[PDB]
Amino acid sequence: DGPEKNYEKTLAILQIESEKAELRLKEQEVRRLMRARGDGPWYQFPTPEKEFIDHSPKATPDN
């Protein structure tokens, strides 16, 4: 085929792999921040469900 093909295929391979590397680096930082702070979609640990609280009037006033 010719040297151009191999040259400009190596360029594409390098681009893809460098982008994958930077994304792999970014994912670890993102996960660290989400786990540490708890303000992301991930590591949202459960809490008691407020759907099952009883809000009707009780037998005694102060509740």
Binding site: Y7, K9, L11
Partner: protein
Amino acid sequence: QLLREHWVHILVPAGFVFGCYLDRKDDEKLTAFRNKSMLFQRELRPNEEVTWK
């Protein structure tokens, strides 16, 4: 016919042809930078659609 004993002489050649096909597909996947490297950046000649296909 005598096929049951000689058909086995198509596996390896078939493997080679299929490997060439897979190599061409891998070539297609890396089409980026086809004419966009600092080197080898000529303008397409008339009636030319790709530099190296």
